[PDB]
Design a protein around this ligand. Structure first.
Ligand code: AVI
Length: 320
């Protein structure tokens, strides 16, 4: 039902400030870009949820299968009574069920950008696990990790390879910051999508049904609405690329003809040449050996490594 603690560090004026800043900088760069965090308004979050069920998008179900078959082992290794989830599901329940089965579950700490979603989880989870304490935190995981409570022995999970949506420099910064908040008896469960057949990688971000394309183009709808811009969404083509040098998927939006875009709120006018491409997201893919090193660099020791038989996806347990 309604039992909940919820702390909110996301102000609408701060969000507006950041978007203006991001869009001005991104659209005036010789190589245009937009940060992917702006994908996730209500519509875009819905579209991502649909992406997780696409035939081509293996990551969610691959990760879920690993959690499904190793839930007990993960929870036994963590020895936690508190689950901290950065980014909010079926995956969630597997972990919580295992903690409950082990008679360890005391507390659930969801960390997400949408307070509404957090409130819904508080009710659902509160109902599913009677007596559980729920302390929700509305924040962005790049700035408010220090606001996460430290009560209990905490299993901090960052699933879905969302860590791959940060380029190396901010990624290392995030991991270090996160590691610094862990006490003895705390653990990090990190999901990393792994280097694999490049055809499979591109198809996962360029599905036949055009759902990912809609997800990508929606960032233009967000800008149109929030900054009073006039992007013609239909004029932009969805492009997914494998960058072999950086070993990352990239999502681009390509102007199929010359476009003139006015962003009224920024007193800004911007031009796209025919065939000009704008970078909207990276999805970095990892090699198993490099996951160990990136954790070590952040001050975390990898104590467990779970991966599906095909080696498509990896889950790390790590501690200070
Ligand atoms: C959120 N992150 C894990 C997703 C974002 C995504 C999914 N499809 C397109 N972009 C990924 O990089 O796979």
């Amino acid at each position: 039902h309604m039992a909940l603690s919820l702390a909110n560090y996301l102000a609408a004026d701060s969000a507006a400030e950041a978007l203006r800043r991001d869009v001005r900088a991104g659209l005036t760069a010789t190589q245009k870009s937009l940060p992917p965090k702006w994908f996730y308004d209500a519509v875009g979050s819905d579209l991502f949820d649909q992406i997780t069920r696409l035939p081509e998008y293996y990551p969610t179900r691959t990760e879920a299968q690993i959690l499904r078959t190793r839930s007990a082992e993960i929870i036994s290794a963590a020895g936690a009574d508190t689950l901290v989830e950065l980014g909010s599901s079926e995956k969630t329940r597997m972990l919580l069920d295992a903690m409950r089965d082990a008679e360890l579950l005391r507390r659930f700490i969801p960390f997400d950008v949408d307070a509404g979603v957090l409130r819904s989880a508080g009710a659902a989870i509160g109902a599913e696990y009677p007596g559980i304490e729920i302390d929700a935190v509305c924040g962005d995981f790049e700035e408010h990790l220090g606001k996460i409570p430290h009560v209990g022995r905490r299993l901090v999970v960052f699933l879905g390879s969302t860590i791959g949506n940060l380029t190396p420099a901010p990624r290392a910064e995030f991991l270090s910051t996160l590691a610094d908040t862990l006490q003895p008896g705390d653990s990090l469960l990190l999901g990393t999508d792994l280097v694999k057949d490049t055809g499979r990688l591109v198809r996962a971000y360029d599905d036949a049904a055009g759902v990912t394309a809609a997800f990508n183009r929606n960032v233009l709808a967000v800008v149109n609405r929030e900054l009073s811009a006039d992007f013609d969404l239909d004029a932009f083509e969805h492009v997914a690329k494998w960058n072999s040098d950086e070993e990352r998927i990239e999502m681009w939006l390509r102007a199929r003809t010359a476009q003139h875009v006015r962003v009224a709120a920024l007193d800004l006018e911007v031009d796209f040449a025919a065939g000009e491409e704008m970078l909207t997201e990276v999805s970095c893919k990892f090699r198993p050996e490099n996951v160990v090193a990136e954790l070590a660099e952040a001050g975390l020791r990898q104590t467990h490594w779970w991966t599906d038989p095909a080696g498509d996806f990896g889950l790390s347990l790590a501690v200070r």
